[PDB]
Amino acid sequence: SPPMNDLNTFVKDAFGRPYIPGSSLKGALRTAILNDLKEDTKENEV
RNA sequence: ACGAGAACGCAGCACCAGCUGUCCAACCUGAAGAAGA
């Protein structure tokens, strides 16, 4: 009951195929492996 | 009316022949197009 004012399209490559882009799964895995601390983020060799 | 007069230290001759400004080296490292209530 709020109309279709805006539509956020899924990310696609040049040919129009949908695909999960880079760094998406990387962040989804960082949000798990980074369970210890918020400090070691960039220099973290993990 | 001078130990003097006359007399080019001159002629020909390529500073030239051979020789890679070359060898080794990732423009690389980390990053959720995402979240109120």
CSV table of C-alpha atoms (C1' of nucleotides) in Angstrom, one decimal:
chain,number,residue,atom,x,y,z
A,1,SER,CA,0.0,0.0,0.0
A,2,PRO,CA,2.8,2.4,-0.9
A,3,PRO,CA,3.0,2.1,-4.7
A,4,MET,CA,6.1,1.2,-6.8
A,5,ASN,CA,7.8,4.6,-6.6
A,6,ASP,CA,11.4,3.4,-6.7
A,7,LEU,CA,13.0,0.2,-8.0
A,8,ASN,CA,16.5,-0.9,-6.9
A,9,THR,CA,17.8,-3.1,-9.8
A,10,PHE,CA,20.1,-6.1,-9.1
A,11,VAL,CA,23.7,-5.7,-10.0
A,12,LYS,CA,24.6,-7.1,-13.5
A,13,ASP,CA,27.6,-7.3,-15.7
A,14,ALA,CA,27.9,-5.8,-19.2
A,15,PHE,CA,25.8,-8.4,-20.9
A,16,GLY,CA,22.9,-7.9,-18.5
A,17,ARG,CA,23.3,-11.2,-16.6
A,18,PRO,CA,22.7,-10.9,-12.9
A,19,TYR,CA,25.6,-12.0,-10.6
A,20,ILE,CA,26.8,-11.6,-7.1
A,21,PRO,CA,29.6,-9.1,-7.4
A,22,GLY,CA,33.1,-9.1,-5.9
A,23,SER,CA,33.7,-8.3,-2.2
A,24,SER,CA,30.1,-9.2,-1.4
A,25,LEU,CA,30.9,-12.8,-0.2
A,26,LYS,CA,34.2,-11.3,1.1
A,27,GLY,CA,32.3,-9.0,3.5
A,28,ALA,CA,29.8,-11.8,4.3
A,29,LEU,CA,32.8,-13.8,5.4
A,30,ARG,CA,34.5,-10.9,7.2
A,31,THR,CA,31.4,-10.4,9.3
A,32,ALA,CA,32.0,-14.0,10.6
A,33,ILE,CA,35.8,-14.3,10.8
A,34,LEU,CA,36.2,-10.8,12.3
A,35,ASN,CA,34.4,-12.1,15.5
A,36,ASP,CA,37.4,-11.2,17.8
A,37,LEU,CA,38.2,-7.5,17.4
A,38,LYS,CA,37.5,-4.4,15.4
A,39,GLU,CA,41.1,-3.3,15.3
A,40,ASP,CA,42.8,-5.7,12.9
A,41,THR,CA,41.0,-4.9,9.7
A,42,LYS,CA,43.4,-3.7,7.0
A,43,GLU,CA,46.8,-5.1,8.1
A,44,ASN,CA,45.0,-8.3,9.2
A,45,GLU,CA,46.7,-11.1,7.2
A,46,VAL,CA,43.7,-13.3,7.7
B,1,A,C1',127.8,50.3,-53.1
B,2,C,C1',125.5,46.1,-46.0
B,3,G,C1',129.5,37.9,-46.5
B,4,A,C1',125.8,40.0,-49.7
B,5,G,C1',121.6,39.1,-54.0
B,6,A,C1',117.6,35.9,-55.4
B,7,A,C1',114.7,31.4,-52.4
B,8,C,C1',106.8,29.8,-49.3
B,9,G,C1',109.9,24.5,-44.6
B,10,C,C1',106.6,23.4,-48.8
B,11,A,C1',104.0,18.8,-51.3
B,12,G,C1',100.3,13.8,-50.7
B,13,C,C1',97.5,11.9,-45.6
B,14,A,C1',89.4,11.0,-43.3
B,15,C,C1',91.2,10.8,-35.7
B,16,C,C1',89.5,6.6,-38.1
B,17,A,C1',87.8,0.7,-37.5
B,18,G,C1',84.7,-3.0,-34.0
B,19,C,C1',80.9,-2.5,-30.0
B,20,U,C1',72.4,-3.2,-28.4
B,21,G,C1',72.2,2.0,-23.0
B,22,U,C1',71.5,-3.1,-21.9
B,23,C,C1',70.0,-7.1,-17.5
B,24,C,C1',66.5,-8.4,-13.2
B,25,A,C1',61.1,-6.5,-11.2
B,26,A,C1',52.6,-8.1,-11.1
B,27,C,C1',50.7,-1.0,-10.2
B,28,C,C1',50.2,-4.0,-6.0
B,29,U,C1',47.6,-4.4,-0.6
B,30,G,C1',42.4,-4.1,3.0
B,31,A,C1',37.3,-2.7,1.6
B,32,A,C1',29.3,-6.4,2.0
B,33,G,C1',26.0,-0.9,-2.9
B,34,A,C1',24.8,-0.8,2.4
B,35,A,C1',22.0,0.2,6.4
B,36,G,C1',16.3,3.6,10.8
B,37,A,C1',11.5,1.4,13.0
